[PDB]
Scaffold this active site. Sequence first.
Site, PDB file in Angstrom:
ATOM      1  N   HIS A   1      41.657  -7.410 -20.076  1.00 35.13           N
ATOM      2  CA  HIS A   1      40.459  -8.154 -20.534  1.00 35.13           C
ATOM      3  C   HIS A   1      39.206  -7.766 -19.713  1.00 35.13           C
ATOM      4  CE1 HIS A   1      43.480 -10.992 -22.456  1.00 35.13           C
ATOM      5  NE2 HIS A   1      42.607 -10.843 -23.440  1.00 35.13           N
TER       6      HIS A   1
ATOM      7  N   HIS B   1      37.608  -3.262 -22.871  1.00 32.55           N
ATOM      8  CA  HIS B   1      37.986  -4.150 -23.967  1.00 32.55           C
ATOM      9  C   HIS B   1      36.776  -4.697 -24.714  1.00 32.55           C
ATOM     10  CE1 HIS B   1      40.288  -7.198 -26.200  1.00 32.55           C
ATOM     11  NE2 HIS B   1      39.360  -8.059 -25.834  1.00 32.55           N
TER      12      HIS B   1
ATOM     13  N   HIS C   1      32.468 -11.653 -25.442  1.00 37.94           N
ATOM     14  CA  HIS C   1      33.463 -12.622 -25.894  1.00 37.94           C
ATOM     15  C   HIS C   1      34.566 -12.927 -24.869  1.00 37.94           C
ATOM     16  CE1 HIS C   1      36.305  -9.351 -26.653  1.00 37.94           C
ATOM     17  NE2 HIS C   1      37.210 -10.312 -26.705  1.00 37.94           N
ATOM     18  N   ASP C   2      34.746 -12.065 -23.864  1.00 45.63           N
ATOM     19  CA  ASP C   2      35.708 -12.299 -22.777  1.00 45.63           C
ATOM     20  C   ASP C   2      35.023 -12.324 -21.389  1.00 45.63           C
ATOM     21  OD1 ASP C   2      38.245 -12.827 -23.941  1.00 45.63           O
ATOM     22  OD2 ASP C   2      38.502 -10.704 -24.442  1.00 45.63           O
TER      23      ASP C   2
ATOM     24  N   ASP D   1      39.446  -8.416 -32.029  1.00 48.53           N
ATOM     25  CA  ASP D   1      40.031  -8.727 -30.733  1.00 48.53           C
ATOM     26  C   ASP D   1      41.373  -8.010 -30.518  1.00 48.53           C
ATOM     27  OD1 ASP D   1      39.763  -9.970 -28.218  1.00 48.53           O
ATOM     28  OD2 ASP D   1      40.940 -11.695 -28.852  1.00 48.53           O
TER      29      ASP D   1
ATOM     30  N   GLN E   1      56.989  -6.520 -29.295  1.00 45.05           N
ATOM     31  CA  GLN E   1      55.894  -5.999 -30.102  1.00 45.05           C
ATOM     32  C   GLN E   1      56.233  -6.059 -31.601  1.00 45.05           C
ATOM     33  OE1 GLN E   1      52.592  -4.323 -29.201  1.00 45.05           O
ATOM     34  NE2 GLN E   1      52.896  -5.852 -27.571  1.00 45.05           N
TER      35      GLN E   1
END
Lengths: 306, 318
Positions: free
Chosen positions: B74, B78, B112-113, B223, B275
Amino acid sequence: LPVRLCKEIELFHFDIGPFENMWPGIFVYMVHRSCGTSCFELEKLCRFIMSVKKNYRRVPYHNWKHAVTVAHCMYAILQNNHTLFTDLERKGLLIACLCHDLDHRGFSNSYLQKFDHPLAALYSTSTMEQHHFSQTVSILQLEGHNIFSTLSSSEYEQVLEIIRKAIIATDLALYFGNRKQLEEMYQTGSLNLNNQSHRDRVIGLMMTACDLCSVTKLWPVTKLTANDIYAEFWAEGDEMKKLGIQPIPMMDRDKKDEVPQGQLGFYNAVAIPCYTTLTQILPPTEPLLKACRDNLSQWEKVIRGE
Amino acid sequence: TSEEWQGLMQFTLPVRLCKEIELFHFDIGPFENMWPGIFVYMVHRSCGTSCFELEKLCRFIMSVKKNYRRVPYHNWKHAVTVAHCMYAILQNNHTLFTDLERKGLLIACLCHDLDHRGFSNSYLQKFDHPLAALYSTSTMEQHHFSQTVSILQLEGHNIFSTLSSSEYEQVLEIIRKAIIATDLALYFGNRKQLEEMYQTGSLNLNNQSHRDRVIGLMMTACDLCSVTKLWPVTKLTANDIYAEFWAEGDEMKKLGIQPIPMMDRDKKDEVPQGQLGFYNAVAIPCYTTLTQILPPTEPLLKACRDNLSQWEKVIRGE
Ligand SMILES: CNc1cc(-c2cccnc2Oc2ccc(Nc3nc4ccc(F)c(F)c4[nH]3)cc2)ccn1
Ligand SMILES: CNc1cc(-c2cccnc2Oc2ccc(Nc3nc4ccc(F)c(F)c4[nH]3)cc2)ccn1
Ligand SMILES: [Zn+2]
Ligand SMILES: [Zn+2]
Ligand SMILES: [Zn+2]
Ligand SMILES: [Zn+2]
């Protein structure tokens, strides 16, 4: 609605069929599926459809069948770009299409002007089209025919304006400039559906696309539909000669054998540009363009005599 | 006049990047001091060269950069990568969005992060971190917006100073909502609601609440875009995601709490399954729904599907 019909009415190249008395049902089904069951009081909508039916004429092409055919094309655009449209547009566009050639006599605005018909003095530009909207309004004012009666005053003015602009846009003369502007707005990225005048223009193009949709049908329907198109135009060319005006070759039955080159020219000059540009703006309308090309291939094949 | 000298100018990337930044699966590369240029470019093409005052915009970007932390996933990379995906969604649906929404969404994505420490909302709650007492839901996400607002309040940092007050508030809402929507907890409710609305035809972009939801799903989709990149990139990015989560699992153990298998380094060999589960349960339905609502976003689904294929290939052992 029958099984085959339910399935195939979703396809752009659907033919409404030879049973006139199913067409009201088909149109009502399309309003229900694309606008909603509670968009219109069913009783008022049937009375309105029947009164519209009645003011279409028994002419070769510009008749009740074409009115419903055009509305269907609109339907398929609505269903495949459904998130784009306001509730007002979900109400007024199909109606606009159904009313868009109300009281057509089988004659161009050119002929009306040469004849010195009253409508030509009453409406100097887009003559038949202003008349189609005038007819639409006056049907709406018949007692029990205000299918928009539960709208607010503001909402009623707005949807009539949608219907007005939509019907006017079916005047092929306005199409050329309109598509030019839209092409140049798409290339340059200025085009934007939040801009009312851009939105108006796209609807205008959607209406040209729907009006000319007989060139997006499968070959057998397109060929047979051409008989009806030319039956009108040749009758008008007959009436031009009676005025003592040489008609253009498009409307001159003595130039039948040149019909294939006539169509080819029109697919290249008008239809292909129209749907090409519409496919750019509303990509899910591609099947219309795809069909148009197949039919453009079929005319070349006809010209070659194979 | 500066609005005038900025009108003549257009920004320029290298030939390979001009061509491939338009591709959904574009990777922003390992050169950090190129990413601001990359962002400014995207802003200029999707918005226009008069959306922002260039000097203010660079100042803003450097500050945002300075407020991302050195964590494995993050991080600044990113942020810029999420912003790129939103750029590709914007360019391929260009007639849908207002000038404001274009301005605001790229900015939202980049921010956004903001000031993320590499820990989930769940860890903050259990740790009894001060942020959890302040924001009882979407803890990190409210903080991200809070930081964003603080950066804009700095002198020479209000990139929206040219807007009317009316438009300023609109863009801040577009940004607030958008950032909150990256809380994956809110995605499941949002998608379900959109799937119903799309199937019944009630879904309508002219309705502000519906539009908000679509924008929400767009934000989720961007995202998670790491799963829409080509295989070699998804496989490598995966290292960074797990470095983070495992370190959280480590801290949970430090609190005397058993972390879920997802954050437990002792369960390295079950990653391929893990995953597989995530693509089935979250990624595929996200892009499936997005491609439904916005057909030009398909390449994200196609790529998502190809990577699902690669994970099955690993599980089998091929
Ligand atoms: C022109 N506006 C219009 C077109 C159609 C229409 C829709 C779909 C297909 N064709 C349509 O009409 C046309 C018919 C003919 C031409 N061009 C044309 N036909 C010729 C025949 C002989 C000849 F010598 C020619 F030069 C011809 N040119 C265009 C549209 C229907 C109503 N109004
Ligand atoms: C969950 N929120 C989130 C996910 C990602 C993310 C994006 C793309 C790929 N992965 C992401 O994070 C995930 C990592 C793992 C899982 N599922 C999972 N992995 C396991 C490994 C071992 C094991 F035993 C398991 F049970 C596992 N489950 C999901 C998302 C990024 C940011 N936030
Ligand atoms: Zn007409
Ligand atoms: Zn017509
Ligand atoms: Zn986040
Ligand atoms: Zn994120």
